[PDB]
Amino acid sequence: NAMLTFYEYPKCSTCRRAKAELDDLAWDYDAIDIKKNPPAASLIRNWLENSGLELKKFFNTSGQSYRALGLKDKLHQLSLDEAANLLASDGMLIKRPLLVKEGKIVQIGYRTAYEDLDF
Ligand code: NA
C-alpha cells in the first residue's frame, strides 16, 4: 500500500493535471475517488486539527454542494467535529485534489507542482 494517497474525481481538471505529474515523477500513489470513497471523518478531523490550514481550505467552495448549503454563512459557526462530519458525509464538499502521505495531509488543491514537496 502506497505511502501516497491521491483523492480525485473524474470531472476535475486540476486532478487530471496533478495525476499527470505523479505519473511523470513515477511516484507511487493510490488514487481514490473522493465522491465514491471520501476520507473518514476521524482522518479529516486530524487534518483540520493538526495541519495548521484554515478550515475553508478544506472545502470545495466553487462546488454546488457548498453553494446549495450556504456554507459561506455557516462555516465560521462550525466546530471542527461538525466540519469533519460534514466533509465526510459528501465527498463533493471536499476540496480536490488531495495528496496524503501516511495519513497526513500534504497538499490541498493544485496551486503548486507536487515535485516541490521533495519526497
Ligand atoms: Na493535492
Side-chain angles (χ1 to χ4, degrees):
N1 46 255
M3 278 198 310
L4 298 176
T5 305
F6 176 67
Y7 285 94
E8 59 164 341
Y9 187 65
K11 191 185 159 70
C12 177
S13 70
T14 49
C15 302
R16 191 174 164 260
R17 286 173 54 210
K19 196 181 202 170
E21 188 191 6
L22 291 170
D23 293 335
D24 187 46
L25 289 156
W27 285 2
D28 300 87
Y29 65 96
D30 179 28
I32 300 185
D33 183 299
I34 203 175
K35 185 173 98 195
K36 296 184 188 174
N37 300 297
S42 63
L43 180 51
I44 296 170
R45 175 71 177 287
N46 198 65
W47 301 341
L48 302 184
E49 294 283 355
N50 297 302
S51 69
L53 303 170
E54 81 182 69
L55 180 59
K56 191 190 189 196
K57 286 176 159 27
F58 290 87
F59 284 81
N60 180 18
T61 56
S62 68
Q64 264 93 257
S65 302
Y66 184 92
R67 291 289 296 168
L69 293 182
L71 293 181
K72 176 101 149 332
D73 299 345
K74 288 162 173 81
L75 224 54
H76 80 281
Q77 303 174 285
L78 297 172
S79 66
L80 295 186
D81 176 70
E82 289 166 357
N85 175 63
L86 189 54
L87 290 160
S89 76
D90 178 7
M92 291 304 81
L93 284 173
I94 310 176
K95 179 61 167 170
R96 53 176 190 257
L98 305 172
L99 192 69
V100 180
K101 192 173 64 169
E102 303 183 317
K104 303 294 197 298
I105 185 67
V106 299
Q107 190 167 323
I108 304 171
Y110 195 61
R111 299 189 84 257
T112 54
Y114 285 157
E115 186 173 343
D116 301 354
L117 295 165
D118 192 23
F119 298 148

